[PDB]
Design a protein around this ligand. Structure first.
Ligand code: HEM
Length: 153
């Protein structure tokens, strides 16, 4: 459980993300792919991609950064009451994309990195701890759903 004040810190910095969803999504995926190249293997079309400018010019990759942040933003705005939003996400990522929980840890790290880089004034220790708690809860719940679907994380 997060406190109401913790959720408000989460949603405060998320409003900043929403001013430029696509640019934040780009930075988060590029950070993910740099820090953890193996994850890039999960995206058929930019498997070949090599440079940051290639990732930044890529139309696909920008659309997926938006897809991620749109879904996650709706989950965060549910303040933990996200079972209905996690059901389809767990379904696809456990049975079709096969995304282990450690890759969700990786992307949570990249999200926190980008939010700190871009909004330090809105992402001090209080707010970083809140966001970390919120992404931890997301990963915990989706992991339980993975197991329900027969996928061991
Ligand atoms: C906060 C974490 C994430 C969220 C909210 C998220 C959300 C989404 C959504 C909404 C879609 C499109 C609908 C669907 O297929 O379910 C999608 C597709 C996809 N996701 Fe995720 N995702 C996350 C993490 C990841 C990670 C860490 C990876 C790989 C390392 C990944 C790989 C994929 C792939 C390969 C697709 C299909 C892309 C395509 O075929 O165009 N996702 N994701």
């Amino acid at each position: 459980v997060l406190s109401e004040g913790e959720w408000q810190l989460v949603l405060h910095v998320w409003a900043k993300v929403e001013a430029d969803v696509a640019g934040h999504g780009q930075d988060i995926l590029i950070r993910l792919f740099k820090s953890h190249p193996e994850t890039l293997e999960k995206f058929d079309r930019c498997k070949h991609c090599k440079t940051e400018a290639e990732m930044k010019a890529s139309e696909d990759l920008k659309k997926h950064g938006v897809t991620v942040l749109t879904a996650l933003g709706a989950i965060l705005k549910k303040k933990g009451h996200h079972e209905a939003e996690l059901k389809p996400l767990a379904q696809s990522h456990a049975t079709k994309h096969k995304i282990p929980i450690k890759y969700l840890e990786f992307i949570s790290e990249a999200i926190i990195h980008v939010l700190h880089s871009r909004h330090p004034g809105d992402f001090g220790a209080d707010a970083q701890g809140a966001m970390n708690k919120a992404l931890e809860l997301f990963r915990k719940d989706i992991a339980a759903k993975y197991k329900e679907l027969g996928y061991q994380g």
